[PDB]
Ligand SMILES: Cc1ncc(COP(=O)(O)O)c(CNCCCC(=O)O)c1O
């Protein structure tokens with residue numbers, strides 16, 4: 151059980167300030183103890199929404215009122231809710247390759263879903279123009295899984311597309327947006343939007359811990375009114391978790407945490423890439439490593455993706471292949487996550503990966 | 511802001527062992543710390559499901575394997591999931607009066623929903639037989655909101671009905687089942703079921719705190735296989751909350767807690783009823799007070815339910831009327847919850863209620 155993790159679905163625990171999180175929980179609990187006997191406001195505790203609002207206004211430039219926000223026990227429960235606010239007959243469009251779980255959720259809900267190939271600037275506007283969908287689902291900070299950072303130019307083009315005819319919506323999934331390495335960070339589509347066509351979605355799974363189960367989305371005014379007319383919804387995110395998060399943010403512990411992890415992840419990513427190129431004698435192609443907590447590696451080998459993956463598991467290496475992200479040759483590509491990866495495991499993990507790819 | 515609560519949607523905080531809960535969280539966290547960097551198993555952490563299983567086998571006689579269980583960030587997210595496992599065209603049947611939120615969820619999902627009146631033994635089997643639905647939704651321990659305890663005889667009758675033709679399902683919502691006052695507790699429908707037609711649903715909102723957001727449901731083998739074929743679902747209940755709950759149960763703190771609250775709620779309910787009958791000079795009818803954390807009171811007054819409710823709010827009394835639970839004269843009826851009600855507020859609250867009903 152000496153497993154090494156190259157997983158893209160994990161967070162670091164070694165440097166997570168668990169004692170501070172617990173201290174924040176105790177403080178938040180004793181301050182709002184009486185409210186724990188009742189359910190949360192359906193959109194989430196107001197003070198907590200206000201704290202997330204100020205945060206994402208500062209870091210992503212997002213423009214909204216806390217009343218527009220809905221928390222949030224996972225992006226999927228929010229997405230589920232979102233599809234019930236949007237027109238029932240809406241045609242969705244997802245990036246290809248992309249998030250298969252969300253693709254499956256949409257298809258399972260009976261929705262028509264188009265897939266849009268990527269170019270060097272991310273989600274192809276030419277393909278969007280051609281296929282004429284209603285609702286875009288896009289990951290601009292770090293394309294999931296390819297890692298492409300959508301430049302401002304393509305962001306404008308998508309925004310121009312949504313604004314020119316009505317009933318066009320853009321779901322901006324800002325997953326993995328906290329960490330941009332040696333490029334400046336870029337404002338959210340939502341921030342650049344002048345016509346309120348963007349639904350901004352965010353999560354704390356990467357910046358904190360995925361098991362905390364706190365996510366959020368920001369609704370355009372008209373979709374917010376559609377939400378309010380339901381009236382039966384209940385909040386799914388834990389009240390204690392909500393209150394703790396607010397204290398964590400407002401006390402400066404979150405900013406302290408992000409500052410530390412930003413440096414840590416950057417140094418670890420650099421060490422890992424140096425180790426990969428040294429072990430593979432530079433016979434590897436690394437893509438999508440300018441932001442986020444994973445990148446893509448292509449190998450020059452006759453071994454199939456499946457057999458490499460099969461051998462990796464026998465080597466107790468947790469790793470996934472690019473075919474996981476197909477919605478619909480001789481260079482297998484894998485996703486290399488490094489969030490959970492222990493610094494002390496870099497060389498051992500990279501050596502195991504070499505044996506998985508080549509057989510020795 | 512001197513509010514008194516007769517709410518049925520609350521839990522006691524004054525006697526909740528918050529320090530023990532926190533001690534259990536710290537212990538659970540340090541024991542399973544490494545797992546917090548990954549997402550939970552989609553059905554919930556296995557050890558946590560096993561702990562809930564043993565608990566509900568002991569207290570409700572429920573018969574299942576942990577593999578059948580799904581957690582659980584609220585009954586509504588589980589119900590949502592359940593309707594996607596059941597036949598899409600299934601005709602549901604709910605108790606009338608009943609849980610309007612769930613009625614709205616089902617209707618919003620495009621489902622046909624019948625309503626079934628109650629008799630002295632609860633959900634009428636004669637009405638069920640007449641209307642011929644597919645899926646029953648029932649609250650046997652303490653009918654929501656009427657408080658009627660479904661006797662074993664009616665439970666058998668419902669079970670016989672589901673077993674006699676295929677594609678008949680019973681959703682057993684065992685909300686408010688922890689506390690039965692001066693009657694013996696009764697085994698769940700699920701426990702008496704010989705044909706695997708029951709979906710058992712439970713929550714910790716009443717026995718712990720509603721803001722913890724942990725609920726669960728137990729699926730019949732065939733519905734479990736239907737669940738497993740989706741494959742894209744993610745867990746919605748917090749991992750820390752899950753792990754804490756397991757430690758809370760397995761350390762004996764839960765049993766200790768339930769023992770204490772059982773006595774506390776029983777004594778408080780008795781004091782409240784004595785206060786009500788004294789203040790209203792016995793001109794009140796109390797119904798559904800043999801279990802659960804609320805009962806029903808009918809008043810002899812010309813004031814409408816709405817005007818009584820309107821005056822109550824001006825008196826800073828949190829209270830709801832029976833019409834809240836209509837899915838589709840001269841004796842207004844209110845629901846009196848007492849979970850959150852402070853012992854020291856009984857007389858002041860009962861005096862405010864008298865002024866709301868009568869005007870002085
Ligand atoms: C594309 C994308 N968007 C959001 C999330 C975060 O979801 P939660 O808010 O934490 O529930 C993620 C989730 N990623 C883990 C699953 C990746 C996989 O390969 O299945 C995401 O990918």
Ligand SMILES: Cc1ncc(COP(=O)(O)O)c(CNCCCC(=O)O)c1O
Pocket residue numbers: 384518519583584585586609611649654683685712713714715720724725834
């Ligand atoms: C009938 C019924 N079943 C289950 C629940 C518990 O739901 P959670 O697991 O806590 O999400 C409840 C919920 N009750 C509070 C709402 C009552 C109302 O008047 O709206 C319930 O009623």
